[PDB]
Amino acid sequence: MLKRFPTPILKVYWPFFVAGAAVYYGMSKAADLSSNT
Amino acid sequence: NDESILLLTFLGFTGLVAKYLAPAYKDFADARMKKVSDVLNASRNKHVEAVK
Amino acid sequence: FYFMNQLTYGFLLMITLLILFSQFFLPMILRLYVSRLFISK
Amino acid sequence: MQLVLAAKYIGAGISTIGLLGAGIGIAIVFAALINGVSRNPSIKDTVFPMAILGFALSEATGLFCLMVSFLLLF
Amino acid sequence: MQLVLAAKYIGAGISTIGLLGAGIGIAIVFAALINGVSRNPSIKDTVFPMAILGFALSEATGLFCLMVSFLLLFG
Amino acid sequence: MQLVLAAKYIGAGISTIGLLGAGIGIAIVFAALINGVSRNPSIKDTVFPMAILGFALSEATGLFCLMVSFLLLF
Amino acid sequence: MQLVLAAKYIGAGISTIGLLGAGIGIAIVFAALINGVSRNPSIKDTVFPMAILGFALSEATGLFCLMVSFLLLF
Amino acid sequence: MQLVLAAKYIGAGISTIGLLGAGIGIAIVFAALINGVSRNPSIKDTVFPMAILGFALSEATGLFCLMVSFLLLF
Amino acid sequence: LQSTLDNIQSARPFDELTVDDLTKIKPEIDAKVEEMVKKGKWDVPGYKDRFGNLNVM
Amino acid sequence: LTTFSLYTIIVLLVITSLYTLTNNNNKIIGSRWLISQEAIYDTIMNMTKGQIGGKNWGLYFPMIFTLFMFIFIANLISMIPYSFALSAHLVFIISLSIVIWLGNTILGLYKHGWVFFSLFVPAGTPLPLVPLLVIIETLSYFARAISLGLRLGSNILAGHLLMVILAGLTFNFMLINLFTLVFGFVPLAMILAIMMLEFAIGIIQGYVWAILTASYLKDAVYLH
């Protein structure tokens, strides 16, 4: 039913995750640069 | 006002969404559980005469 | 502008859906597959 | 006010361009109708009314253009 | 203000011509319908509701151009 | 504030001109659907999603022109 | 300045008019794919990727028009 | 200088229209390619290259129009 | 074997059996799923023969 | 808690109460809800074979599924005239397209390295034609990524505003006409038609987004 049979969750999904992290670093500085508040 | 009329109209549309004039997916689903149930009658019995 | 609790949270949402699908209902669909497979045999 | 009426007339004239659609639409509809009726006379009775309806709809779009041009004329 | 209303008028008039594309789209849909029913009379029932759908989509695009002209006129 | 608004309206109109191609395109994709299913009744399930997808592409194309128009409206 | 922005707006609007061809092009590409699958259903798997390739190319044309329009805007 | 840059923007917007022709052309090339390949699966290997090159420089024509628009902008 | 026939006639949960109960009745049903993922046989055939894929139109 | 975040919480509240909160029949059927998602699950699973298949289609299946679920749910409840849908900004749809492309290349650069640059020259286009094609191919890679994000969000914005603009006209019509009848139900009729279109387009554009992001994954994993 919800019997957890292990499947790839992080083993092969790393590239998009590290891409997201590389986005995040800079993704907050873009708002800081264009504060306009 | 105008906003209240729009919600009432979609509720009528949602009422028409309720009908779909005997929706196909209802019968498309109806064909499924019978198909699912019937094969379990045949498949389980298939090994029943295996010991028979 | 506002990104903190949405994009990181978006990937966390994808991870949660990944769990609740691939660990729960992919095994469920597979389990019914193999269940009826052994029902025939 | 002079420029207002001037551009109103200009807008009506440029809105009348839409009749090109009605014209070449009835054009292609009747061309297909001729091709179909020549293919076999049996299908003519079934195909003519819907071709007429398509003509009516294309010229209804043309009439919409004409009406908006009319609003930019009176 | 006068030039603003004048520009609104001419912009609406130029935006009207989407009904040209709507009419040609519905015309070509009906033309393909005619050819299909003539070649295959049996496929007529299968293709007619689809043709109504395509008509509706093309005339929706044209009518939306009409409302764009309307909002340029009155707004 | 006057001339800029006027040119904004004119640019909006001459960008709304773009939906012509989107309509003609969705219609011709669907026309090809009609002809293909008429010639081959068995390919309907194979070709219908493809033509619907092409429809969505051309409609999003016209909607892009529409958005370019809106950015010069509000 | 005001005339500069006005011409920016009208140039963006008249840059928008180059994507009707992109829409018609992606549409005729998908139409030809429908026709080809009608003639040759088996070759559909081999022939499909070129449809998306041509779609991407024509969309690239349309967004080149977008790039001109947007650089004219902002 | 105001009118000069204004008309430079207008000219760039008009010039970027070449992508319409580029897209329509590459799409008719793709349409003929698909029709021929479906009608002749064996011809695919020897009809791929010049079709690729042809729509490539058909797009290069629109690229030339885009470059004219670029020089008008800058 | 006669008791097996009497066993099967009144013990047929063809509409209410649990797959986890199938795990309990045979650990092989449990066992055969883990090494399936680890060895890389992600795709599972043998389904469309019995149930259609149920594709939407 | 911005409008985006609270909307995102509402998304997951609906997500769990379709298939996670039935879980009682211990069968493949027994609830028509289950038939609903497995239909969608099967349409994308076979699509995963048809587009990503050959070595690792099932490996990358969930991202296409999760993204399709994300777009599907975000487009369902988007018609009500007060639907402040996705903050009326839709900037994240661009962001999703950007991160999807950016992850696509890193996978390409990781799995191919310098070979990823050979993707710009599929079959022919010799040295005289190499610079022209690599310019078209590389610019295209930026091109359809940004186009994918903007087209979905703008049309949702376009659909939402054409809800309101036509609605205001109906308010004008029903207030001015005294005794006639054909002034407000026909504008109501278009409202009924234009709402079905917006509901319809969101469904396919979610599918189109699913097919597209699938299409770019092929190019990253497989060089052609």
Curated annotation (Swiss-Prot), chain B:
It comes from the Eukaryota. It is found in: Mitochondrion; Mitochondrion inner membrane. Belongs to the eukaryotic ATPase B chain family. Mitochondrial membrane ATP synthase (F(1)F(0) ATP synthase or Complex V) produces ATP from ADP in the presence of a proton gradient across the membrane which is generated by electron transport complexes of the respiratory chain. F-type ATPases consist of two structural domains, F(1) - containing the extramembraneous catalytic core, and F(0) - containing the membrane proton channel, linked together by a central stalk and a peripheral stalk. During catalysis, ATP synthesis in the catalytic domain of F(1) is coupled via a rotary mechanism of the central stalk subunits to proton translocation. F-type ATPases have 2 components, CF(1) - the catalytic core - and CF(0) - the membrane proton channel. In yeast, the dimeric form of ATP synthase consists of 17 polypeptides: alpha, beta, gamma, delta, epsilon, 4 (B), 5 (OSCP), 6 (A), 8, 9 (C), d, E (Tim11), f, g, h, i/j and k. Present with 12900 molecules/cell in log phase SD medium. This is ATP synthase subunit 4, mitochondrial. The chain holds residues 88 to 139 of 244 of the full protein.
Swiss-Prot record, chain I:
GO terms for molecular function: proton transmembrane transporter activity. It is found in: Mitochondrion; Mitochondrion inner membrane. One of its GO terms (biological process) is proton motive force-driven ATP synthesis. Coiled coil: none annotated. GO terms for cellular component: mitochondrial inner membrane; mitochondrion; proton-transporting ATP synthase complex. Keywords: Acetylation, ATP synthesis, CF(0), Hydrogen ion transport, Ion transport, Membrane, Mitochondrion, Mitochondrion inner membrane, Transport. The keyword Membrane applies. Its main location: mitochondrion. It comes from the Eukaryota. Present with 6820 molecules/cell in log phase SD medium. F-type ATPases have 2 components, CF(1) - the catalytic core - and CF(0) - the membrane proton channel. In yeast, the dimeric form of ATP synthase consists of 17 polypeptides: alpha, beta, gamma, delta, epsilon, 4 (B), 5 (OSCP), 6 (A), 8, 9 (C), d, E (Tim11), f, g, h, i/j and k. Mitochondrial membrane ATP synthase (F(1)F(0) ATP synthase or Complex V) produces ATP from ADP in the presence of a proton gradient across the membrane which is generated by electron transport complexes of the respiratory chain. F-type ATPases consist of two structural domains, F(1) - containing the extramembraneous catalytic core, and F(0) - containing the membrane proton channel, linked together by a central stalk and a peripheral stalk. During catalysis, ATP synthesis in the catalytic domain of F(1) is coupled via a rotary mechanism of the central stalk subunits to proton translocation. Belongs to the ATPase d subunit family. This is ATP synthase subunit d, mitochondrial. It comes from Saccharomyces cerevisiae (strain ATCC 204508 / S288c). The gene is ATP7.
Swiss-Prot record, chain J:
CDD domains: ATP-synt_Fo_a_6. F-type ATPases have 2 components, CF(1) - the catalytic core - and CF(0) - the membrane proton channel. In yeast, the dimeric form of ATP synthase consists of 17 polypeptides: alpha, beta, gamma, delta, epsilon, 4 (B), 5 (OSCP), 6 (A), 8, 9 (C), d, E (Tim11), f, g, h, i/j and k. It comes from the Eukaryota. One of its GO terms (cellular component) is proton-transporting ATP synthase complex. This is ATP synthase subunit a. GO terms for biological process: proton motive force-driven ATP synthesis. It holds the Pfam family ATP-synt_A. The chain crosses the membrane at residues 1-21, 57-77, 90-110, 115-135, 156-176, 181-201. Belongs to the ATPase A chain family. Keywords: ATP synthesis, CF(0), Hydrogen ion transport, Ion transport, Membrane, Mitochondrion, Mitochondrion inner membrane, Transmembrane, Transmembrane helix, Transport. It is a multi-pass membrane protein. It is found in: Mitochondrion inner membrane. NCBIfam families: ATP_synt_6_or_A. InterPro entries: ATP_synth_F0_asu, ATP_synth_F0_asu_AS, ATP_synth_F0_asu_bact/mt, F0_ATP_A_sf. Gene3D superfamilies: ATP synthase, F0 complex, subunit A.
